[PDB]
Structure 1
Amino acid sequence: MRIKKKNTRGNARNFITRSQAVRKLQVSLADFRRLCIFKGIYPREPRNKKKANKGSTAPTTFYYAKDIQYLMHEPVLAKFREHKTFARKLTRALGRGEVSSAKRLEENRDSYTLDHIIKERYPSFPDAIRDIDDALNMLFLFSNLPSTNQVSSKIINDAQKICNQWLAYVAKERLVRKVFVSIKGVYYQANIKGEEVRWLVPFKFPENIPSDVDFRIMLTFLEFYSTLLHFVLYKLYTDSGLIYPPKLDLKKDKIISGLSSYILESRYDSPVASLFSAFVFYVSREVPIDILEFLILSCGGNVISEAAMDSKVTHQIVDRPVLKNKVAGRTYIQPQWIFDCINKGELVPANKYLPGEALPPHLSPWEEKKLKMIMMSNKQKKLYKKMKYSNAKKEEQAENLKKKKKQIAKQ
């Protein structure tokens, strides 16, 4: 054959530049990014930066040619184009003064659905359960986010309803096996089909919203996460035989509209699920019911809230410096004891966590030689030096695990 060019094959065709891919797709960067997020496409590091390009040392992001080529045939592009055409037509109608025509046009529109995207991105339910970690982590945070100009209140309400559905299913299924509390929030873990899915529930305080973060990307991710969560919830309810979607409890919604509402029905096999069995609890006002109520409900206990009006209870939770009544029939407990019980999975004695006492720390449940190294090769010598430098940090951590722990105790 004729003289082939210096670099026009191999990495030069397997990867396509971001700008080149966008130009070939004839799609705006916003729409391309949305499609990428929906498909989960990501940039890849070429084996040789200067070989993928034509000797260019300038920075670049290399995508997979096959992935982009396959993405070009997805219906989502057609739906996006239809949405753009509908938007232009609605703008024309609004500018023409025919509000009724605009209302009729808008009322007859239908949005796209990502159901087929899920069946190809996560062909099997275990994969969806594995990847639901990020979806839960985002939805739980968005549930407590107050409504703003960047996100309509309907989206926040839908996210909160999805989170409530998930929490109710978990409590009824009692699949929770490990819990933890952190500054960033309260971590919850459930053995959903043995996948030990973990999610972080942030504190219910008013979530500060820094305007720097671009909500457009966040909303795009949240849409896919909400669809995935809805499908997973439907699948789980069908597998368990419970009705779906469960009906909200209007009577309970008036009081606190907490986890108690949204009752579910059909149509104790583990130490975690058997703890607190048949127990009745009373939560003081100052303790977060939203956090403790879920744990007790999953454990199979009963909780009486102070707001029940806004005894027979064998356990009481209060964080006040001084308890007022101290009825002998109620066992006063700090939430740290409840957390420790779930972490260990056994009924640790309650006498160690009386109110007002010290709070114990809470931990998560999860030349002889130099002589022979003179002749080592450059690669081996560098590897050994880097390994020693890395192990220096491990040794420092091991030393510090006891140094301060012993020094502070003496004072």
Structure 2
Amino acid sequence: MRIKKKNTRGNARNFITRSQAVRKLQVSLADFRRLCIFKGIYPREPRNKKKANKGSTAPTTFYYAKDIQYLMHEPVLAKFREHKTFARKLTRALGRGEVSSAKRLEENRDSYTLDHIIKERYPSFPDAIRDIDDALNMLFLFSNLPSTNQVSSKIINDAQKICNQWLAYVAKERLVRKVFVSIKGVYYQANIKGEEVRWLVPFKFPENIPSDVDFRIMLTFLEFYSTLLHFVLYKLYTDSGLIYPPKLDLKKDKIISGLSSYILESRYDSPVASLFSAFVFYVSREVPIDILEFLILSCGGNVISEAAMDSKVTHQIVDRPVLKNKVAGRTYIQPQWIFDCINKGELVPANKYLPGEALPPHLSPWEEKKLKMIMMSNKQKKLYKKMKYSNAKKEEQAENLKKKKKQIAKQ
């Protein structure tokens, strides 16, 4: 054949530039990135940059051609055009002045569903659990955020309902294995069929919403995660023989509005799932009953909330500066006891967490070479130097920790 141009085969056509991909798809960057997020597509870096970018050295972003081509056949692309046309026609009606026509048009529209995206993105059920970490984190973050002009109240309510349903399922099955508390918030590491899924849970305190962040991407992520978690919860409930959706007692919702509100019914295998068995724990006003109650319920018996209509218990959780009465019938234990008990899994002694007593630190559950180096090659020499530097920097983790411990031990 005739001469073949350099930038026409190989990496040149194997990867398509983002700008070229947008032009080929004839879709706005917003919709294109929405589809990419829904399909879970990511950019890729070839071993040679100039070769892929038509021989031009630029900070171009590359995407796999096959994935983009497959994306073009997704019905979501047509649904986006349908939504755009509906919005244009509704603006036309609003400008005309026939509100009734706009209402009739709205009553006919139907929203697209990501059911077929989940099937291909997660061919098997365990795959969804293996990556539901990000979905759980996002849902737990959004459930606590306040509604604003960007995020609607309904979205936050749905996220909170999903989080509550997940917590209720976890508590009913007692799948909690390890827990942790940090500045970022409390961490929960359940075991859903052996996936050891971890999910952060921030404290139930107000959070500032800076304008720097863009919730538009977060809105789409939460929209996808809503369907993902709904399907996962339905599958889990069907596997466990529990009815779905789980109804909630409005009487409890008015009082506590949380874990106990959802009364899940049909129609124990690990020491962590047996701690505090047949025990009843009292919780004070200062402790985060929302976090503490779930842990105790998943581990052992029920909990008596500090809330009332505004005893046969054996332990009481309180974090007041000074104990109030200390009735002989209630054991007083600091909230740190529950976390340490879960981490140890063997009911750590309660005599180390009495009220006012100092709490123990919390720990997360997770010579001739000088001459011989002459014969080493340049690349090998550089690699050995990098390895030595990496060893030295890691040694600092122990050196500066032991030095600071020695300094602290003075008093």
TMscore range, shorter length: over 0.9
The question of whether the paired residues in 1 share the 8 Å contact of 2:341 and 2:348 is answered with yes
Question: Alignment partner of 1:94: what SS?
Answer: helix
**1:80-120 Cα distance to aligned partner (Å, 9 max, x none):** 00000000000000011000010011011110000110010
Q: 1:44-102 deviations in whole A, cap 9, x for unaligned? A: 00111010122211110000001001101110000000000000000000011000010
What is the CA distance between 1:256 and its match in structure 2?
2.0
Q: Could you tell me which residue of structure 2 aligns to residue 252 of structure 1? A: 252
Q: How far did 1:402 drift?
A: 2.2
The equivalent residue for 2:86 is 86
Q: Distance in 1 between matches of 2:184 and 2:362?
A: 15
Provide the residue aligned with 2:364 in structure 1.
364
- Cα deviation code 1:355-394 (max 9, x no counterpart): 1011110001115111100121111011001111111111
User: What is the Cα deviation at residue 298 of structure 1?
Assistant: 0.5
Contact 1:255 1:310 in 2 (8 A): no
Query: Cα deviation per residue 1:269-307 (whole Å; 9 max; x = unaligned)?
Result: 110011000001111111110010000110131211121
The answer to whether the 8 A contact 2:25-2:72 is kept is yes
Map Cα deviations across residues 236-264 of structure 1 (whole Å, 9 max, x no partner): 00000001110011110111212110110
8 Å contact from structure 2 (residues 352, 359) kept in 1 = no
SS at match of 2:20: helix
CA distance in 1, matches of 2:147, 2:388: 52
Match of 1:388 in 2: 388
Contact 1:280 1:303 in 2 (8 A): yes
Once residues 362 and 224 of structure 2 are traced to their aligned partners in structure 1, the CA distance between those partners, rounded to angstroms, is 35
Task: Name the stretch that deviates more: 302-311 or 59-68.
Answer: 302-311
Consecutive unaligned residues in structure 1, runs of 5 or more: none
In the alignment, structure 2 segments of 5+ residues that lack a partner are none
Distance in 2 (alpha carbons) for counterparts of 1:383 and 1:364: 33
Q: In structure 2, the residue corresponding to 1:339 is in which secondary structure?
A: helix
In 2, Cα distance between the equivalents of 1:6 and 1:325?
A: 85
Q: Secondary structure, in 3 states, of the residue corresponding to 2:260?
A: coil
For the 8 Å contact 2:43–2:61, the answer to whether it is kept is yes
Matches of 1:288 and 1:99 in 2, distance apart?
48
Q: Which structure 1 residue ranges, 4+ long, deviate > 4 Å from structure 2?
A: none
SS across alignment from 2:303: strand
Deviations 1:181-215 (A, max 9, x none): 00000000011111100000000001111111011
> Could you report, residue by residue, the CA deviation over 1:99-155 in whole angstroms, capped at 9, with x for unpaired residues?
001001101111000011001000011110011000001000000000000000000
Q: Distance in 2 between matches of 1:254 and 1:129?
A: 32
**Distance (whole Å) between structure 2 residues aligned to residue 105 and residue 8 of structure 1:** 49
Name the stretch that deviates more: 13-22 or 301-310. 301-310
| Superposed counterparts of 1:113-152, under 5 Å | 113-152=113-152
In 2, Cα distance between equivalents of 1:74 and 1:61? 23
How far apart, CA to CA, are the structure 1 residues paired with 2:245 and 2:378? 64
Q: Distance in 2 between matches of 1:319 and 1:95?
A: 60
**TM-score normalized by the length of structure 2:** 0.99
1:410: how far off?
Answer: 2.2
Of 303-312 and 196-205, deviating more is: 303-312
CA distance in structure 2 between the partners assigned to 1:310 and 1:317 by the alignment: 21
CA contact (8 A) 1:44 1:64 kept: yes
**Aligned twin of 1:181:** 181
Counting matched residue pairs gives 411
Query: Which stretch shows the higher mean deviation, 136-145 or 392-401?
Result: 392-401
Tell me if 1:37 matches 2:25.
Answer: no
Residues 141, 201 of structure 2: 8 Å contact kept? yes
Confirm or deny: 8 A CA contact 2:280 2:303 kept in the other structure: yes
Alpha-carbon contact 1:178-1:188 (below 8 Å) kept: yes
CA distance in structure 2 between the partners assigned to 1:230 and 1:128 by the alignment: 12
Tell me, yes or no, if the aligned pair for 1:315 and 1:331 is still in contact at 8 Å.
yes
Q: Which range moves more in the overlay, 310-319 or 126-135?
A: 310-319
Q: Whole-Å Cα distance in 2 between the matches of residues 39 and 6 of structure 1? A: 32
